[model samples]
Target chain A: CPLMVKVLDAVRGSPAINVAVHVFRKAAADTWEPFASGKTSESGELHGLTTEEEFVEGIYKVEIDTKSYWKALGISPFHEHAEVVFTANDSGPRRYTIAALLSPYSYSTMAVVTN
Target chain B: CPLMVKVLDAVRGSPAINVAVHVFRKAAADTWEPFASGKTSESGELHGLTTEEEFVEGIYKVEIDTKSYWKALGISPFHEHAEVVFTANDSGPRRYTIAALLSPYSYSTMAVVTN
Candidate 1:
């Protein structure tokens, strides 16, 4: 399976651009190793962070450097970072997109799987 | 009574800097008129937007131009604007301060009163 991640500024329903984004694959119990890192684009998306070449049945995590992003805009942000974790299945949808909704005070994320 | 408003990004716990802020006083039911408009200082605050001189016991609204602020920093924000509304009491706290915490996807605000 291939995995993509998208971030949005929830209030305006627009993409969250220029945000530092990171991906990790769970390597062991209570342990995760860095998989990929990048920043959101003009579309508030970081795609191809995960692909079939590296896809496995396990847990994955995505972290957004939200605090620095907010600070860069000159606003007092509430959290240092926001993260979302999901399970990848070998027999499931071939493509997975994890969408993150972020605010200054709170954040939420969801997963959509497509065959 | 006097009033102040503050904005935060909610991620970094630092002051939100250089964002536009607006304040409004409720003049009638279902209507709010602009009271003050300014950009946040280096401290992520727009103080004295409401003062006892023009302060009255009514509903006041504070607006934060979150989108433009983010866009300026090269991030696609979630909201075009964020707002906080509260009531000012003559006999209650001599001063009221409304603080807003904003992120790309969501926002939260609170009121603090001082004598």
Candidate 2:
């Protein structure tokens, strides 16, 4: 199934965060290619994504550029990189929300219920 | 094969950015559960990740919390969140990278060829 997820993390006492995402399908038996890319808005939002036509039933990833996002504030993060990997099949629903909870030191992510 | 991946993004002239990641395996035929999560540091880096034993051969996603991250700065973003979905198998390498390029209003993500 084609999957579209999102990220979220904000605390009143921490610096601002920015995140971008991209998808790739297993092009061949051992190859992968870019499918889409976009980032969050000034209000911590991102441009909408479409997996309807681009989505392929296979493996994909969402990379979050946090190191540079935080470095702009002169704060050296503890981790150099953070990312998530998941699989997609042709047997599920349309969209899902995979939110991330992040701070300067730690973070977390999960699928949010659609209400 | 268990998979561990990372995210990256940091341009010269832009707002400070932050990112985090998580991993969830297809626990059941239809249920997806939490596996692990974490965030990036101030110096544009993440602490480090280990997907050994925790990574299962299945589909997953990486969610970024951008809406609140930018909203904390009083920025009204265009989108609410940004996310990506990918798949994993027990027949590949051990690690990969999915970096996100972000700014005050836009961003992108993809898997980088590791060195």
TM-scores vs. true structure, each candidate: 0.51, 0.43
**CAPRI quality band, candidate 1:** acceptable
lDDT of 1: 0.77
With candidate 1 superimposed using the best TM-score fit, by how many Å does residue B19's alpha carbon deviate from the native?
1.1
Writing each residue's lDDT as its tens digit, candidate 2 over B1-115 gives 2333344433344433465556555566756677666665565444345445755556566565655665766664423344544555444454545455543345455543232
In order, what lDDT does every prediction score?
Answer: 0.77, 0.51
TM-score of chain A of each: 0.86, 0.72
**After superposition, which runs of candidate 1 have C-alpha atoms over 4 Å from their true positions?**
A1-115, B11-13
lDDT of 2 at A18: 55
Tens digits of lDDT, candidate 1, A10-115: 6455788999988888887788998888889999988767667677788878888988876776766577888888787857647888887776667777888888
| Chain B TM-score of every predicted model | 0.84, 0.70
Q: What is the per-residue lDDT of model 1 for residues B66-106, given as tens digits with 9 covering 90 to 100?
A: 88877776666667898777777778558777787776557
Q: What is the DockQ of each candidate?
A: 0.25, 0.03
